[model samples]
Target: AAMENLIRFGEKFFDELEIAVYRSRDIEASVELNEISMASTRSGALTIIRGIKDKRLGLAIVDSDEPEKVKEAIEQAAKMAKLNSPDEKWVSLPEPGKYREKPKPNYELKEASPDILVEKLVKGIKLAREKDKNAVVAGGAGGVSWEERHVLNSHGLDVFQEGGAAYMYLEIVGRKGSVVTPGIFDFDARRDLNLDVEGIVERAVQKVQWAYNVVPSKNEEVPLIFGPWAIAGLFSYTLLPAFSGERLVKETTPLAGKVGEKIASEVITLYDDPFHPLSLRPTIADDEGVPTRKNVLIENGAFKGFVWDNYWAKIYGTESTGNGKRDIRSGGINIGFHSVVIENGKRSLEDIIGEIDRGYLVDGLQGAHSSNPDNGNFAVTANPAFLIEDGEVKGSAVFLIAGNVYELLQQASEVSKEQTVMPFMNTMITPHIKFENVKIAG
Candidate 1:
């Protein structure tokens, strides 16, 4: 292969070298107005990291796979690394080691055909339209995909991994008389080709129907129930980066110097699990070919440890957490999450809902980009929300919620026993989180 040729040629020049080869094939399908709009197959090499030297690396991305172009990129990247200044936190790359066993994929097929993808999208769109004459699928999209990677280094690191992905998204709108509810969107991804097209459509349609009946806001602090999407937003904005070794080293996170401290309610527990069976794309080793393992970031509300890449681990006098990932724009490596799993509680979603006397159920958060990562402070609009009174959904309303992340955790009222798999930069399994004393403004 051209990738192998480039690696072989580049290794001859560098004192230390690392190379990564990525290949992916994708079949995408989209539907609008209950008809297939587009169906296509795209295949390409995503990126290739050329070499590692002086704690700096060069990533070369080429549109062509021609042997000459690849060889030229390899030489140019190697020269750049050789000429770059040494990073003071430089440490050696990961050596070969035992990695976790790969789990059975959720949806892996021999062929990710565009025909199959389009069929699924069309089916979903039709189902949504069938739910109600007033309900319509405004737009839908889905894809089938496969990705392969090979990593090699002058050190004993040599690794290869391949994964499959199937995903679908549906947007539904409900109209009644002159009132047209805002569109609702839902999506899911898995490793298997099997998709719950009907279920996704149904959820989106139901949300729109729920939005048909609007209610006035209660400008008072009450129990706040976070749905699956809101839970993912909370974790992404508040918890994900707080446990990063890089942030701790720079003291940019409030969690800095707080390891082993009880930073959350005792009911909270979080794990960084790279090999979750339900993971759409799972890998046994990290970007630097380091073997990945399950890491507990929070146990019984106590801050346990932070995730680390090789560079930060060396700087902090700790071992790498196998989270080192290639950053193409940075032309180096950085720490990244694998999958974050929140421990389930004893109460089901229905039970939690039944227990709430008065609360606000938030579907999703808007304006998450304005959140303050360092202090965990967020001011976001809670769109597509509902009012719950006396253990029953009264009506829908939109509101603004503002609070500190740590405060929300400390006031955690409950976590649903059931968990929902959400795809972010990393996969997350979280349940409905209930927080009391939340500030709300309609």
Candidate 2:
């Protein structure tokens, strides 16, 4: 879809580096969707398209290891940029810089066959059902691969990168005949996934069983323990915006000018590490071709640094942390924190809940983006929540958790040990979380 535009852009630029490229080519594409009540449907597709990011394209000079590829890419992009109207905020492309080889998964994606995947999914689903007898919807497993993550720019940036991922999700349906509520069981591993499958199934089944026949409760302010999935939701809302250099450049983040201010719990230390092994983003350079680096976003509750790429770093007088990125083949530079990692908290979910006299167990969230990134005022609905009394899950509650995300993080009395990755908006992952004194609209 974007090839023509890239071709046009390339028409207007040229380089001379001899770029080498390696692209992954998959022989199979399949997705067997097994929803508990519905008949299973399998879908698959196979095609080859290029994903090129014009990294290190400095004007007035072209110096790169893969000058040939850089030349080809620029020739394609030049015409496109000319045909399109220039944005008022347009600036020069990123200059060349030093980069380091960040460690990444070998990205060995093609291992299991379709039948093997199907069996795995079936086993997980059966485990959930056998354990709870209430599992209504289950997704066995899904896999995807990036065949070509090759790169070449005029600034010595040449890359041949590839990665793959596979995951399974099980939805446990809590039903009293027609009134059905659902709890989700999700496990994901990429590159290397060796898990105790039966144990995970048992946990899913146990959660579903606990959710069965839940009693309703009145609205009240209580402690809220966000499981791994729920933590992902809260972090996507509260912690994510803080990583935006755009927000910081415009004086948007609450931590603006408060570089050392305490913004989170003393136990919470957050950072963006494209190199973190478990992160889903590329373990390589940023969109601007700068080598990836590890940096702290927050340290023990104090706001540490704002994420920035070379361009924005120069614009803000801050150093480039190599966080510039765009979509796979998209143009334009933006603030980035591809792998937002947080320091693990001390208390386990059970232990934290045991300490709470009364509270709610927020397994997930609805309307997760309800926060104002600038001032940190947010009110989100809690989905699939469990009621806690005297440190035990007494029942389930159908209500919304409404409060400021800033307040929840800063004043959260205790955070849980359950750190599980969840799909953040736009594929960013987040872990489980818990909040104290949060208002519940049951």
Candidate 3:
């Protein structure tokens, strides 16, 4: 407990106290019009304090870990706790647990510089230009980050962890004469600086290669193949909240009380793969000092169970799946997936497309964030989409994919064996998931 003295100051005021110390160093390079326009390196630290008194909670944060400032924040937290109503279901802070596998950071990436990221950014831009001299990189970014976290609580929880990761993304627009394709977004990421800059640019170019011509789309009930990126956006408001233990308690989730029941197509299995090498955000534990694990949420259509944090777990009488994530700026725990993945199916991408008589392939979704998780309704516009006709990409399409998420999954036909990380929401990795009788609104 490096902050043992500071922790003592808060312990006197509350029955329990949890202190989280976060530190990070990052170097990022941004691209503008096929060139690295800006490069920056940043380092910062924050101390988050949570105090509980008689089931009443108090939270406060200090940018500096200085002794005097932390003490003031602790006192302020206690004052806040005294004025709040008690939560009958409040539980003790999580206890220290064993780390079966801990990942140490690579010092090489931990001490990365802006030039390190700029080099990759420049290389990506050059590669895209090489694909088509006229092809322009609308926007892109590449970066490496190193993070360290320390958690200490009066409940005998004390843990420390550090890790590093590198990632790159390029948004490119394929141009043929005056007509331009809807910009394509592709990305590559890894635990170290060994990112595939070449492949990242190539995929974007390939997707846009067939999208130069614009075609009209009309209202129809047809098959929809949600590309990897589209799955990420689709899940933000749907799958993620559907399994929330907090939402279950409040009767706000559609999947509430549905464990052991069929909730999706049996062909698809969605679960959290927390320890995968490409999963860059988390290390050993959650933001609450609980050991993380692979949570099988949906297995072959049957609903397994809900994810929880310490607070909700105590209320539900279960163990935390270690999904307790927190935004330091917010100063509280929220249940979230670490590295959720949709298990691949037997069908190859070519075979899946070959069987489609007429369908739409959507690479990204706009306004998917507004989907209703409680009712499972989504009305999202497909961007950089392809019009699939008789086993081939015909042309670019403009249409809205709208339906209830639960209904869409029940009609799910197949998932492609080729899975990849999403361009922006990289944590939710998936393949092309095909759904039948889906609505295409103009």
Candidate 4:
């Protein structure tokens, strides 16, 4: 298999450098449903990083159907690595160990076609339009995934596997004369895609109408509701760092040395489930061939563990969390997870809306970099959000959502049952989540 060959080459490459070789490969499919969108499917993306003392220069070679091109790319990377400045210490790979079996999905969905995807998207848009004549603009998206990865190092570690994911989404923009508001809906599955176009459209129309009359509530720690995407983004930028083996080793994660600490509210329980059955990330071995598995990052607000690659685990005196990433050139750790499973609360999205007497139901944000990964502090700008009064969506507000993510987690009031697709270091699926006592600025 191509993966086995890559593993052999990686081992030989490491032998030559006298330094360890950490490598990973990815095959991804990006589909577009909107009229003005793009889609791409990569059959192979090979990354082999040569680890040195202080720094590691990476080498990436992607081949759609050209092996020679990939090989040349790899060789060129070696030349560059040899010519580049030296590092502080030569890095090592993790020893051979046991990893979980790869995750899998249905075969039919694995071979999704563009035409079929476009048709599905159109159906969703039509449904939304039917619900509201004001739905002037429509957008949709669909994607299917498949990949195999392998990793080998001087330490006798060898891993390999395959995985897949599927998703569909639609959006509607309501224009009440000169007033413009956007509503979004989606459907996703790992093994198969069974989307309800009409159902999604109905929800979108409701959300759009609810957003028709938004007003800003002064800056204060008040109640806030997060749409699906926002919830995923929050977790991606904040809680994810705690899982990075690199962060833990570098003492950059706040949760370091506090594995059992009750850092979040009892309502928050975060799990890294490999066989989540609906993950949009690779369920097989990561780029370096470590079989992935279900692991808990936080259980009931208590810090559980960190994600790990082979080298960082050894340095930290811990085991590999099977979350290692091998980019174009295999060198260091990459914070990656197939999917994050947050323990869901009982409330439905609408029910949670009523739960807030006065708050904001924010679906999107502008700048994500406002937060520091090390500490989880943030003051983000919100573009279009809706105001809530007496559990009913009132109107739109033009302002910002500001607060420390750490505090938000500890004060989260409710979470919704519907999960949606969101891209992080990789694509992740998350549900609608609500936070309490968040500050909103006009």
- The prediction achieving the highest lDDT against the true structure is 3
Can you write out model 2's per-residue Cα lDDT over 1-442, one digit (the tens) per residue? Answer: 2333333444334332222233443322222334422223232321111222333232211222244544444544444443555333433444555666645555555444444445555667666656556565444344434444444444445544556555545555556566565655555544444434576676666667667656776778777777767666666766677667777787777777888888787767778775665665555666555668888887888888677876667767666787766543334456766666766666676777787788888776744447676676766767677778888877666677666666777765655554454434534344445665777776
At residue 38, give the lDDT of candidate 4. 56
> Which digits, one per residue and each the tens of the lDDT, describe model 4 over residues 178-297?
767744444444445565556666766777886666554576666777776667666677667767888877888887788898888887788776566556554556555566777888
Kindly report which residue stretches of model 1 are placed more than 4 angstroms away from their true locations once superposed: 1-8, 52-57, 63-69, 104-107, 328-331, 367-369
Instruction: Please report, as a residue range, the 10-residue window in candidate 4 with the lowest summed lDDT.
Output: 17-26
Please rank every candidate by lDDT, starting with the best.
3, 1, 4, 2
Q: Per-residue lDDT tens digits of candidate 3, residues 1-442?
A: 3478777777889999998888899889999888789998889888888999999999989887677778888898999999999988887889888764776557788888888788888888888889877678999898888888888888778888888878888889877878887778888877778888889888888777878778899989988888877888888767678898998889998887678998889977988866864476656888989988889989999999888888898888887889899874597888887888888887798898888889888878754435888888878788878889999988888788777888888988889987776535428778889988887887
What is the C-alpha local distance difference test score of each model?
Answer: 0.77, 0.57, 0.83, 0.62
Off by over 4 Å in 2: 1-76, 83-92, 101-107, 110-112, 138-141, 146-148, 176-178, 183-185, 193-199, 328-331, 367-369, 423-431
**Which of the two candidates, 1 or 4, achieves a greater lDDT against the reference?**
1
Q: What is the lDDT of residue 280 in candidate 1?
A: 61
Best by TM-score: 3
* Candidate 2 displacement at residue 151 in angstroms: 2.4
